[PDB]
């Protein structure tokens, strides 16, 4: 099937790591689904504009990292950058 | 307009609605079932005609008409109770060459249907 895809399978996979026994209501799961579509578009739009700033025609991981630096308040940005860079580091070795 | 019509004729009455609160319903029924000097009780066929006792009156008038017989039968038998002391006449005002005739015809048809369907000796003897 297809019709309407969403984040629900990843908001519940990531929730089962932080709190193995905690569930999530359909409304709250929908709210998380919506929230991720916010940050995705925000980071990707700032990254597209960043590519446009240094006149690149590609959004690389460097653009995404600089877009993450521009939005997260310090500690949030300092840990999100580490998450992204570790994921990219570990994905290039496989 | 019945409430207005009866004052034009000076008839002492009281009336019962879906809007009359419960304790007032009981008070009105008592101040008519057990009190004379009131001539007339104006009441709604559903809210007033469903299940309460009124032996203190007769001459039931059906000003309206409805194709569902249940309400009319139920309302008739508000007078025709155990504890009655006079024969109960039941008047029914039908406009001529007007659909009210057909409404009573439909009511009679459904009445006959019920007569057939459930009155066939569902007694304690069987």
């Amino acid at each position: 099937r297809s019709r309407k895809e969403s984040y629900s399978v990843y908001v519940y996979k990531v929730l089962k790591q932080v709190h193995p026994d905690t569930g999530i209501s359909s409304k709250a799961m929908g709210i998380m689904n919506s929230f991720v579509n916010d940050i995705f578009e925000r980071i990707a739009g700032e990254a597209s504009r960043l590519a446009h700033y240094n006149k690149r025609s590609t959004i690389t991981s460097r653009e995404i990292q600089t877009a993450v630096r521009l939005l997260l308040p310090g500690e949030l940005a300092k840990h999100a950058v580490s998450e992204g860079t570790k994921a990219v580091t570990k994905y290039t070795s496989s | 307009v019945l409430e207005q019509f009866l004052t034009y004729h000076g008839h002492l009455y009281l009336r019962l609605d879906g809007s009359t609160r419960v304790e007032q319903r009981q008070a009105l029924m008592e101040r008519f079932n057990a009190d004379k000097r009131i001539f007339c009780f104006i009441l709604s066929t559903r809210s007033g005609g469903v299940g309460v006792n009124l032996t203190g009156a007769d001459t039931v008038v059906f000003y309206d008409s409805d194709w569902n017989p249940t309400m009319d039968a139920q309302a008739q038998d508000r007078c025709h109770r155990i504890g009655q002391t006079r024969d109960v006449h039941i008047y029914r005002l039908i406009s001529e060459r007007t659909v009210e005739e057909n409404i009573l015809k439909k009511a009679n048809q459904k009445r006959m249907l019920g007569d057939m369907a459930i009155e066939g000796g569902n007694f304690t003897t069987a």
Binding site: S34, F35, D38 | -
Partner: protein, 80 residues
């Protein structure tokens, strides 16, 4: 029609209670109704522009979410 009085004084007082207000002036209900009717008309006007453009006759919740994001006021929970 003029049904801006459906937002009644008790409702405005409940919205003030939720907002921490613990005493409300008398002329605060005829103010809040003018403040709320300007905010509604702005978000509805933008939701009807997103609905006319899609050649649709019903203002869907997506139109309201898009028009609310246009104002800056971002709400989470209706598919956007």
């Amino acid at each position: 029609r003029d049904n801006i009085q459906g937002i009644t004084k008790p409702a405005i007082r409940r919205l003030a209670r939720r907002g921490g207000v613990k005493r409300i002036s008398g002329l605060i209900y005829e103010e809040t109704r003018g403040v709320l009717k300007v905010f509604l008309e702005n978000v509805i006007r933008d939701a009807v522009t997103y609905t006319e453009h899609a050649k649709r006759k019903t203002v869907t919740a997506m139109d309201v979410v898009y028009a609310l994001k246009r104002q800056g006021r971002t709400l989470y929970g209706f598919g956007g």
